[PDB]
């Protein structure tokens, strides 16, 4: 409940993690840098989204080269550049899942060790409405939560190559 994992998650909530509302509902979204952010492809964003309740025009959208979609928003604010934290070193890592959508606002779940199975799998009974949650640890952003099987959750892996 404390330690640097919690501080990292809270700072991400402060600067980079938002609620993105599409016609399919509320999802957690991750700002990467500039005006680029990421959401689950299942969210099916249109030409406008709500970013923490504010209507924002989508300048561009595209799927990645895995259930993740990149949006460039028509927004004033820039995201803190968190690309340096994107990591694929996840073994031996007790991770947190940070969600900010639906009733799970400012929510930091400690999901335990994570492994590849390919997606990242973590043993924690996930509820619905947490899609888009950021899988991370201190100084490390691993992926975006895109589903579960009722006893495990699964995250699509983030990679530095996706963002030039």
């Amino acid at each position: 409940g404390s330690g640097p994992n919690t501080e990292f998650a809270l700072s991400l909530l402060r600067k980079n993690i938002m609620t993105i509302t599409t016609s399919k509902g509320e999802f957690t979204g991750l700002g990467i840098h500039d005006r680029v952010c990421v959401i689950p492809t299942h969210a099916q964003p249109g030409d406008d989204v709500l970013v923490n309740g504010q209507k924002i025009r989508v300048k561009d959208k595209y799927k990645l080269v895995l259930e993740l979609t990149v949006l460039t928003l028509d927004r004033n604010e820039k995201f803190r550049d968190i690309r340096g934290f994107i990591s694929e070193d996840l073994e031996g890592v007790d991770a947190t899942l940070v969600v900010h959508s639906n009733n799970f606002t400012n929510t930091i779940l400690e999901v335990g060790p994570v492994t590849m199975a390919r997606m990242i799998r973590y043993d924690y009974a996930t509820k619905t409405g947490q899609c888009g949650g950021v899988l991370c640890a201190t100084g490390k952003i691993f992926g975006i939560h895109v589903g579960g099987n009722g006893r495990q959750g699964f995250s699509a892996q983030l990679k530095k190559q996706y963002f030039v």
Partner: antibody
Framework: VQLVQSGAEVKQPGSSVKVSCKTS????????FNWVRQAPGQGLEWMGG????????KYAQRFQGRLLITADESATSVYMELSSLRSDDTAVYYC???????????????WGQGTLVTVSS | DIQMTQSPSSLSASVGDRVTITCRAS??????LAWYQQKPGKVPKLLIY???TLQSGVPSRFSGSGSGTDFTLTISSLQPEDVATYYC?????????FGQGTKVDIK
């Protein structure tokens, strides 16, 4: 990893001192940094910290109200400014990197060389 | 505030001796504890974090143990280069409080 601090300072009571700490630029934009001081012959004392990537600021209660910690990206440096100097502020001031990245609150894995501040009286 | 206290505060031992230093936190800090070594006239240096994880490069004669409130740093065979002051520090959350330090000398 390199943390290069500014040079020795001599100050009178009631004034203020600013100490700088320079790092590479990759490190500045990803890590947190802490200020720790050490009076002559005494122990280490945590003063505060900043993670520039997230504007995370933390201050020790003992210095709250007379300590300002800042960052400049162009200079890739973090700073501490201590005001209302008293002679018990005579100490070596250390800049130190918090480990792993993105946080102030962590173990400190690299230390700058230290800056002696002498407050006369 | 919060207290980090070490025991003993100083000791003198012989080369080859087993040396044990303890640290007590007034509040539980789980395993968010680091140990630092400050050799005379040098800057402090990280020896151990997460209470028992050796920083890379640190000799294996240094070991740490404990969780919660009671922690121990052990030097299994005291070497001349180990003369120093050793500090514990919590980082469960701010403040990142240091213990008062334990001065280790050799007769």
């Amino acid at each position: 990893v390199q943390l290069v601090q500014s040079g020795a300072e001599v100050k009178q009571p009631g004034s203020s001192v600013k100490v700088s700490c320079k790092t590479s630029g990759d490190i500045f934009s990803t890590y947190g940094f802490n200020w720790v001081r050490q009076a002559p012959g005494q122990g280490l004392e945590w003063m505060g910290g900043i993670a520039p990537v997230f504007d995370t600021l933390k201050y020790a209660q003992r210095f709250q109200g007379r300590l300002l910690i800042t960052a400049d990206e162009s200079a890739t440096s973090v700073y501490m400014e201590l005001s209302s100097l008293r002679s018990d502020d005579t100490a070596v001031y250390y800049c130190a990197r918090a480990g792993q990245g993105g946080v102030v609150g962590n173990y400190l894995d690299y230390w700058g060389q230290g800056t002696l501040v002498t407050v006369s009286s | 505030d919060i207290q980090m206290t070490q025991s003993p505060s100083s000791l003198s031992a012989s080369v080859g001796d087993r040396v044990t230093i303890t640290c007590r936190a007034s509040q539980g800090i789980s395993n968010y504890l680091a140990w630092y070594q400050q050799k005379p006239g040098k800057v402090p240096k990280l020896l151990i974090y997460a209470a028992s994880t050796l920083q890379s490069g640190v000799p294996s004669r240094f070991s740490g143990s404990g969780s919660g409130t009671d922690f121990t740093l052990t030097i299994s065979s005291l070497q001349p280069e180990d003369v120093a002051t050793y500090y514990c520090q919590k980082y469960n959350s701010a403040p990142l409080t240091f213990g008062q330090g334990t001065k280790v000398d050799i007769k």
